[PDB]
Tab-separated table of C-alpha atoms in Angstrom:
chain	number	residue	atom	x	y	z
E	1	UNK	CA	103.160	120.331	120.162
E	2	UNK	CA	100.617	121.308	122.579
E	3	UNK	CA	96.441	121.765	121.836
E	4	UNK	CA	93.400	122.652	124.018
E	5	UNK	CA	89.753	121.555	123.505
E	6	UNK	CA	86.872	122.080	125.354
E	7	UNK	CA	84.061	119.133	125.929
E	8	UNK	CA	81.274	119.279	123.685
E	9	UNK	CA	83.047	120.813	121.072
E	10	UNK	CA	85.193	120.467	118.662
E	11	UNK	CA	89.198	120.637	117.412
E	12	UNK	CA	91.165	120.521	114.599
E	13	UNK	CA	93.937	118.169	114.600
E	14	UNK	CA	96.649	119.326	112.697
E	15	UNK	CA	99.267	116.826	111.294
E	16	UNK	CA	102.872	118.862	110.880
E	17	UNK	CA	105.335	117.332	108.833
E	18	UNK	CA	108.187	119.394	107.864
E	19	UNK	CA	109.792	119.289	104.767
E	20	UNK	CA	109.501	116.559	102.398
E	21	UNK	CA	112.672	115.836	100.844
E	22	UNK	CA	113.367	115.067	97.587
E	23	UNK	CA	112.907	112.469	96.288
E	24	UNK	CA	110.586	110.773	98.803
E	25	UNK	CA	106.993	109.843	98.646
E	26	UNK	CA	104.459	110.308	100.727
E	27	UNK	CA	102.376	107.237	100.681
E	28	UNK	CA	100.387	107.393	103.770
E	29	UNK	CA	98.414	109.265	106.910
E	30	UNK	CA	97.912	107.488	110.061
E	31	UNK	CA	96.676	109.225	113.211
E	32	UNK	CA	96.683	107.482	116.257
E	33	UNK	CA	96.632	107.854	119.946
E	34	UNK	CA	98.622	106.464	122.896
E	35	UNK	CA	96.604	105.178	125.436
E	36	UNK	CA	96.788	102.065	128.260
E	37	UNK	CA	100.329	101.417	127.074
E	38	UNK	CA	100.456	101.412	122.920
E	39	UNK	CA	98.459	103.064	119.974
E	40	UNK	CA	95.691	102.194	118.493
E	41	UNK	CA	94.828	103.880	115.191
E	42	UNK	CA	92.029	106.563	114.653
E	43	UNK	CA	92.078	106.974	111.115
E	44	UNK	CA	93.747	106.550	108.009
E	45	UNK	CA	94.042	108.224	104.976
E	46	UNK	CA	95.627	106.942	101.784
E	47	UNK	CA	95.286	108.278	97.989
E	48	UNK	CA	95.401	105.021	97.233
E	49	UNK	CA	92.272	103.773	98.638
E	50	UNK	CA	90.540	106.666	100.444
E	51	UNK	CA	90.037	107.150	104.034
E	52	UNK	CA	89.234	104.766	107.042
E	53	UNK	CA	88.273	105.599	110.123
E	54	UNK	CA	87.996	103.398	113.277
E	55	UNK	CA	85.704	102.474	116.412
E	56	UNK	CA	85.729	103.800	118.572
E	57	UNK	CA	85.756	107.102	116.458
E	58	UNK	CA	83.400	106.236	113.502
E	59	UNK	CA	81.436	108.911	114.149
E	60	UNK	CA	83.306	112.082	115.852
E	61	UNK	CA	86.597	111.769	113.141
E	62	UNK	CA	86.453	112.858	109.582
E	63	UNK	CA	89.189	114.339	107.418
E	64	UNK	CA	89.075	117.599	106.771
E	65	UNK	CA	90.671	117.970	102.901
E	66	UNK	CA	92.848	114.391	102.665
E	67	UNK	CA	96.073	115.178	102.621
E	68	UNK	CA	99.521	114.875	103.720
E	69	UNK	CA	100.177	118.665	103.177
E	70	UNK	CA	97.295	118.437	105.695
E	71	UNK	CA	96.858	115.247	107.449
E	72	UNK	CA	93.837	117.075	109.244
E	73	UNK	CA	90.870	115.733	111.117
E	74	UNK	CA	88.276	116.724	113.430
E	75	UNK	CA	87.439	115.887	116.432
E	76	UNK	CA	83.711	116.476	117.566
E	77	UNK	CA	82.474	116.455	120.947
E	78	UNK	CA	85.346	116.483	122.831
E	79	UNK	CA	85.535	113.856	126.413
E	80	UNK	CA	87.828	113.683	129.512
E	81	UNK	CA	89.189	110.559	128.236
E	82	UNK	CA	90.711	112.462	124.572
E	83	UNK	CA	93.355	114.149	126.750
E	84	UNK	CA	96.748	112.194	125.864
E	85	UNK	CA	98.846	112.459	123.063
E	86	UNK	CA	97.858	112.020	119.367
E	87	UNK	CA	100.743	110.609	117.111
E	88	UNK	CA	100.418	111.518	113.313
E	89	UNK	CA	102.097	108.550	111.298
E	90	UNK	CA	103.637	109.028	107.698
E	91	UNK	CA	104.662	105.791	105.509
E	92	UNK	CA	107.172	107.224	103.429
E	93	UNK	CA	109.382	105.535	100.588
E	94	UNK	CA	112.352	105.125	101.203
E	95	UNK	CA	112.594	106.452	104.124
E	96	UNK	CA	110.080	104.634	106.190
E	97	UNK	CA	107.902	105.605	108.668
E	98	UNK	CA	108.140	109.028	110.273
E	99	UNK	CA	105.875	110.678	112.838
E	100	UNK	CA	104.988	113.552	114.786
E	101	UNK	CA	103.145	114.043	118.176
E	102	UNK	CA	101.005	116.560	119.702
E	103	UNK	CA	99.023	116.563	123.631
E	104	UNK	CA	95.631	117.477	123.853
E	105	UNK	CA	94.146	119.096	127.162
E	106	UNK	CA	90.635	119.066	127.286
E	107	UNK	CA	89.323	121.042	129.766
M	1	UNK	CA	116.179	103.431	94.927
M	2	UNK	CA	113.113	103.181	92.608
M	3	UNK	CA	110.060	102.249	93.888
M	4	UNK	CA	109.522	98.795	92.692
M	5	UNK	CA	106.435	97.993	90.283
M	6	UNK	CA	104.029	95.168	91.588
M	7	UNK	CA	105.001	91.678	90.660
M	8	UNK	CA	102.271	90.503	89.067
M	9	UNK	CA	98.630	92.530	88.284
M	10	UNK	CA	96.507	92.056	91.470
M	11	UNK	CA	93.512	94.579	92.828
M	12	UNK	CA	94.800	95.826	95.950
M	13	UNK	CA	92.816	96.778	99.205
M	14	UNK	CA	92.688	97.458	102.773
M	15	UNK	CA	90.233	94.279	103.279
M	16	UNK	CA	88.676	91.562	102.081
M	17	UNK	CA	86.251	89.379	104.115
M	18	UNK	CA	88.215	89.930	107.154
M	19	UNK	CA	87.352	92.205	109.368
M	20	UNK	CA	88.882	90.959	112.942
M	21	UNK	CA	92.362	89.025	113.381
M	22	UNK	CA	91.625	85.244	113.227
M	23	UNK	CA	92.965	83.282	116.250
M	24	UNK	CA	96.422	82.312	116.678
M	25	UNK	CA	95.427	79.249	119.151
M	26	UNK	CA	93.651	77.348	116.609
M	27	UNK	CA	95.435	73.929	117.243
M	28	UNK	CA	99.001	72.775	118.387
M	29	UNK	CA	102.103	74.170	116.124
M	30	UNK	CA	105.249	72.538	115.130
M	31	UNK	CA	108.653	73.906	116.641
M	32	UNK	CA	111.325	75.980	114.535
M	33	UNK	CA	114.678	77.459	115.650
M	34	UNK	CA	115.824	80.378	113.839
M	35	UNK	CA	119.619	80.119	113.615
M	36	UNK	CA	121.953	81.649	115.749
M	37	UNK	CA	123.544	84.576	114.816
M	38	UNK	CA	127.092	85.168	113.565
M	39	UNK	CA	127.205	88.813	114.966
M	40	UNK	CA	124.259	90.720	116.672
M	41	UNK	CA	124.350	93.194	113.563
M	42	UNK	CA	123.456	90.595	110.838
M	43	UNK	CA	119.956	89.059	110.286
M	44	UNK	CA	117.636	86.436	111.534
M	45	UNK	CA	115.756	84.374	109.386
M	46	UNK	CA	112.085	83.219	110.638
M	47	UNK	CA	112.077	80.568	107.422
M	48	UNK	CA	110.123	77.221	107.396
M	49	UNK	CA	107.839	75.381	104.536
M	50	UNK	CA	104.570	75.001	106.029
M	51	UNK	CA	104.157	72.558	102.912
M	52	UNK	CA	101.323	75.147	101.803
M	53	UNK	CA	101.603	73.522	98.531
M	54	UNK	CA	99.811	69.973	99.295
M	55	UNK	CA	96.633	72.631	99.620
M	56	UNK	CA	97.392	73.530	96.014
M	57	UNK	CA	97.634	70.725	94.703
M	58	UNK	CA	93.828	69.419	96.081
M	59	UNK	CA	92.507	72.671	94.884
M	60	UNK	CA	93.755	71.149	91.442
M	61	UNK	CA	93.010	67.474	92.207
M	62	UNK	CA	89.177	68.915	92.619
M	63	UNK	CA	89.405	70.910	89.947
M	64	UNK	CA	88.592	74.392	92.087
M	65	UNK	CA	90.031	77.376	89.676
M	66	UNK	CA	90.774	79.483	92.743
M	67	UNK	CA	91.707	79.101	96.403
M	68	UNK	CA	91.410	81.804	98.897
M	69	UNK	CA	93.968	82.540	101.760
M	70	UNK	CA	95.318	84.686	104.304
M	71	UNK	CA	98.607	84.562	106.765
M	72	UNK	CA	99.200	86.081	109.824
M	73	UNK	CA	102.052	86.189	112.470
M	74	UNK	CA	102.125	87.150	116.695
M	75	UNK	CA	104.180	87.029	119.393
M	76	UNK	CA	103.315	84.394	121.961
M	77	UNK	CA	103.732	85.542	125.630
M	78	UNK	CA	101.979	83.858	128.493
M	79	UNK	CA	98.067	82.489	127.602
M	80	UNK	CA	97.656	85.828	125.668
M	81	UNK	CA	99.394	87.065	121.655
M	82	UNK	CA	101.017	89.892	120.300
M	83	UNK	CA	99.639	90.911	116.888
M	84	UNK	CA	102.327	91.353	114.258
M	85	UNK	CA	100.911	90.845	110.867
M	86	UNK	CA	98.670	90.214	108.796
M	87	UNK	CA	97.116	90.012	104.967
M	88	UNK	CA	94.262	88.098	102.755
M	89	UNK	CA	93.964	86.754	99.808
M	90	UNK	CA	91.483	85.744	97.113
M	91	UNK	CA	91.389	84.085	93.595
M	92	UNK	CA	95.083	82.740	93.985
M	93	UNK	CA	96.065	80.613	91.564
M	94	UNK	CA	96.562	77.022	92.837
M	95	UNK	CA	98.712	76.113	89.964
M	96	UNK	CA	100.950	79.333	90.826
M	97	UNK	CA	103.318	79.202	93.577
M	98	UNK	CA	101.947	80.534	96.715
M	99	UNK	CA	100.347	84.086	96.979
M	100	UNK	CA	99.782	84.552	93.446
M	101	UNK	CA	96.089	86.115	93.913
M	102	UNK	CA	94.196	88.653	92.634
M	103	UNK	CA	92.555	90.103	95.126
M	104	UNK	CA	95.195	91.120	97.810
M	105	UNK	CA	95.015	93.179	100.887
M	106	UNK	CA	98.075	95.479	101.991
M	107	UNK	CA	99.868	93.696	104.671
M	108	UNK	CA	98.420	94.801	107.874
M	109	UNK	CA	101.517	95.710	109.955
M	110	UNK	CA	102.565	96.620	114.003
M	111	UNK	CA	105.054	99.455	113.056
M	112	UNK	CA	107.615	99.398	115.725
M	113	UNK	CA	108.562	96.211	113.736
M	114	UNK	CA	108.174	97.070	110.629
M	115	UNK	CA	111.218	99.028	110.919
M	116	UNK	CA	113.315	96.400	110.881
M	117	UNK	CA	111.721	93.057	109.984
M	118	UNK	CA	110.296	92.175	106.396
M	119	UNK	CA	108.926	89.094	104.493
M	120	UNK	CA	110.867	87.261	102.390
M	121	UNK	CA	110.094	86.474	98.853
M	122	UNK	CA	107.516	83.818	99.155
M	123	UNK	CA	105.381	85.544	101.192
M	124	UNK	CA	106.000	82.779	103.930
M	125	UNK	CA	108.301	83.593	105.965
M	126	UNK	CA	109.820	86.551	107.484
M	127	UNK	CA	113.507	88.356	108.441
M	128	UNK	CA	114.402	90.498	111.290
M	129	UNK	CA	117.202	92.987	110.900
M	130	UNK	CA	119.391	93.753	113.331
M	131	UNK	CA	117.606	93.153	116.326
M	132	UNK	CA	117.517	94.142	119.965
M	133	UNK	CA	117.914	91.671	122.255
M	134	UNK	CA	113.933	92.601	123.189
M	135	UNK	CA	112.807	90.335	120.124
M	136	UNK	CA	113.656	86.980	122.016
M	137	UNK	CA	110.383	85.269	122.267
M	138	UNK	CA	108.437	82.718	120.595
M	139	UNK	CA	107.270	83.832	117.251
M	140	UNK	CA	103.549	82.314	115.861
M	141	UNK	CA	103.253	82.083	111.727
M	142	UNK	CA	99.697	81.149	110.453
M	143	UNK	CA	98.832	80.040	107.198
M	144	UNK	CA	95.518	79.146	106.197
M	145	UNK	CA	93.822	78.433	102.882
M	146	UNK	CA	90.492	77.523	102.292
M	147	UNK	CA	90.018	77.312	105.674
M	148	UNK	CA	92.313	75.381	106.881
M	149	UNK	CA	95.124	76.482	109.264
M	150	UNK	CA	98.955	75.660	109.493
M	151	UNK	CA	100.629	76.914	112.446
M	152	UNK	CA	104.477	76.943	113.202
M	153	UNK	CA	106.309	78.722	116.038
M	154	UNK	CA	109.431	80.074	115.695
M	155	UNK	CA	111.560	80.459	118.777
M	156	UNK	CA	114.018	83.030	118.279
M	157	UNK	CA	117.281	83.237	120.798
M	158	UNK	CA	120.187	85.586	120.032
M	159	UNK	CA	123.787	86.517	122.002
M	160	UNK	CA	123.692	87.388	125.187
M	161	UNK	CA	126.192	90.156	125.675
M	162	UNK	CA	126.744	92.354	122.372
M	163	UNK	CA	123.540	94.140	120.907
M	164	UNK	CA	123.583	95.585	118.040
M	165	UNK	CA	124.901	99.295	118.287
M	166	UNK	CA	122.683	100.458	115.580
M	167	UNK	CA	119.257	98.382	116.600
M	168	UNK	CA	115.695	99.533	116.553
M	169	UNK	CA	115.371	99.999	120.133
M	170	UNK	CA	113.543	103.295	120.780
M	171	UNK	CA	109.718	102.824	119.848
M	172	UNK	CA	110.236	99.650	121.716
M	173	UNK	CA	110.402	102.159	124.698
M	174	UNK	CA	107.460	103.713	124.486
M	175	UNK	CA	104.993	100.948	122.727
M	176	UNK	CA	106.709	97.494	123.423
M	177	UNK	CA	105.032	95.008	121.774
M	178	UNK	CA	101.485	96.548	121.521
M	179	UNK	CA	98.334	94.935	123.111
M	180	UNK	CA	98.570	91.624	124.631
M	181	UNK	CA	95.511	88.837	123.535
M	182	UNK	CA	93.620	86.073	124.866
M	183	UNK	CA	91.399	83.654	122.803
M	184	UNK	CA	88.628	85.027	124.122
M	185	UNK	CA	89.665	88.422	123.095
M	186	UNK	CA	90.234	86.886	119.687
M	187	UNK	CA	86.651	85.379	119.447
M	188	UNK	CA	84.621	88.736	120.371
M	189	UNK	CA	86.821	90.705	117.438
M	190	UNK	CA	89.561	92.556	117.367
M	191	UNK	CA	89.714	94.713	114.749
M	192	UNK	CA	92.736	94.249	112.302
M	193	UNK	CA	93.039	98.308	111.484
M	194	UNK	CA	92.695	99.751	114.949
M	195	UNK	CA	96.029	97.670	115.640
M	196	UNK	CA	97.763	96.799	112.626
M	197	UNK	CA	98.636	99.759	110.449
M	198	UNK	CA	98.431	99.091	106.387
M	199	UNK	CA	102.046	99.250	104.951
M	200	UNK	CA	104.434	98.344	101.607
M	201	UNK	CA	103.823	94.776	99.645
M	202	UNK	CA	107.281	92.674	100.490
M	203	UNK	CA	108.991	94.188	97.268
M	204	UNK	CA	109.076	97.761	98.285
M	205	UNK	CA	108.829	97.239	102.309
M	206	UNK	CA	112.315	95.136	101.451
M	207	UNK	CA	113.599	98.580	99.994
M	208	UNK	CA	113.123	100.242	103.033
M	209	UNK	CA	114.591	98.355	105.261
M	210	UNK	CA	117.187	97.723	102.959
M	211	UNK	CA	118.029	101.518	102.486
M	212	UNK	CA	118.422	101.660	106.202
M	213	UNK	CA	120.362	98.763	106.941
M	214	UNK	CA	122.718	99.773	104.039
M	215	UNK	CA	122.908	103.529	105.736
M	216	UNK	CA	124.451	101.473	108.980
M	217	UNK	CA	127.169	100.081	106.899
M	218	UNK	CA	125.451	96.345	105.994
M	219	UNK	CA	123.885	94.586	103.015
M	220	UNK	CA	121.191	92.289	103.027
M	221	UNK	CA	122.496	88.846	102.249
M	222	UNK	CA	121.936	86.960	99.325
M	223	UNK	CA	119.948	83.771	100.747
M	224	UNK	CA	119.223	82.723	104.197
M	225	UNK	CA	119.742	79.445	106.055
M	226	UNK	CA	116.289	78.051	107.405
M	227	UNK	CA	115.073	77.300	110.732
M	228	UNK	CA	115.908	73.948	112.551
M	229	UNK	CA	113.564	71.469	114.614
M	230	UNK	CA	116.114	71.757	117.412
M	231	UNK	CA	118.367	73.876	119.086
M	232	UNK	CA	121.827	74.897	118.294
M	233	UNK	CA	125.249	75.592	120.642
């Protein structure tokens, strides 16, 4: 999946998982981004215990409505170095974990 | 395959009073040898008392109702660590076996992993299913309570020649073994959430892996040999 941003503003992140089979659970939300080599996470949302979000992105991420028939943040004030690709994590049982990917262009 | 209850009533979290991953270099660290294995598909067994217990039993000998605790494990390359896991305890039970706390965090995992390697019952040691022939390396276990810190490496060799034809290989690809760290890294903080990812408690992670082992054909085995101070073959 492919997404555009401008700088100084803001996107949506969308997380898109497909169809969740019966009978699994979705435990988890995990967005994170590739960068220098490996991920790092941006934020984390579980029903669990709530949501977490990280440094460097305490203060441009926030969930939208937490959810994994979401899984959607925003992203404010958009920078050069956001371009890459965005992985969307989901801990599911029994399957495991199973994610999806999207590029952002900011231009 | 149910998802299995918790073992024993705890309060469950994402932290405790750990914010950063605690050092992995915090003294020298006995030698273990996980046991060869008998076929590239079957699984390796990172197991070794770290005599944890003695702990316990001074917590009782001064009469403190409740030690605290976490335990972590990394990959050692060259001057620098992988992270791989790690969780914290507090108000464990001294007179309980090991890990019987409650206040608990999630285990704090590096996915790629995850997919294939689990704890085993006691919380102390760990098994890796299946693996590629890219998780030869030396493998760092830390357990500390109260403060004070046991490490053990685990050195981990398996066949040359036949890999498993049903391994984990392809995050491996793209993410490796995640960010390399020195002490010093260590020291100024690195944060346990921006590189570990919260995942199952052993019971259900052990389902998991379990229900994709058994989709390749395999069964977890029953018990598992431990790890030797010496080298095999």
């Amino acid at each position: 999946d492919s997404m555009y941003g401008f700088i100084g503003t803001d996107v949506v992140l969308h997380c898109s998982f497909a169809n969740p089979l019966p009978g699994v659970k979705i435990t988890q939300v995990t967005w994170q981004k590739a960068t220098n080599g490996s991920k790092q996470n941006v934020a984390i949302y579980n029903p669990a215990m709530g949501v977490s979000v990280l440094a460097p992105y305490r203060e441009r991420v926030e969930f939208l409505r937490p959810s994994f028939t979401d899984g959607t943040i925003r992203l404010s004030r958009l920078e050069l170095e956001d371009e890459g690709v965005y992985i969307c994590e989901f801990a599911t049982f029994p399957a495991g974990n199973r994610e999806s990917q999207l590029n952002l262009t900011v231009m | 395959p149910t998802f299995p209850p918790p073992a024993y009533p705890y309060t469950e979290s994402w932290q405790l009073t750990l914010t950063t991953v605690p050092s992995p270099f915090v003294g020298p660290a006995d030698v273990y040898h996980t046991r060869p294995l008998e076929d590239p598909c079957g699984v390796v067994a990172l197991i070794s008392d770290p005599q944890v217990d003695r702990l316990l039993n001074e917590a009782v000998a001064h009469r403190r109702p409740t030690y605290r605790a976490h335990v972590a494990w990394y990959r050692i390359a060259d001057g620098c660590a992988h992270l791989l896991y790690f969780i914290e305890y507090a108000d464990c039970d001294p007179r309980q076996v090991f890990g019987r706390c409650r206040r608990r965090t999630t285990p704090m995992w590096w996915t790629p992993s995850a997919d294939y390697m689990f704890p085993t019952e006691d919380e102390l040691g760990l098994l890796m299913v299946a693996p590629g022939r890219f998780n030869e390396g030396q493998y760092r276990r830390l357990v500390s309570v109260d403060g004070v810190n046991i490490l053990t490496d685990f050195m981990v060799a398996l066949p040359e020649g036949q890999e498993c034809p049903f391994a984990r290989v392809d995050q491996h690809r793209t993410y490796k073994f995640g960010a390399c760290w020195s002490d010093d890294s260590f020291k100024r903080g690195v944060d346990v959430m921006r590189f570990l990812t919260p995942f199952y408690q052993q019971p259900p992670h052990r389902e998991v892996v379990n229900y994709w082992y058994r989709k390749n054909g395999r069964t977890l085995p029953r018990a598992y040999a431990a790890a030797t101070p010496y080298a095999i073959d």
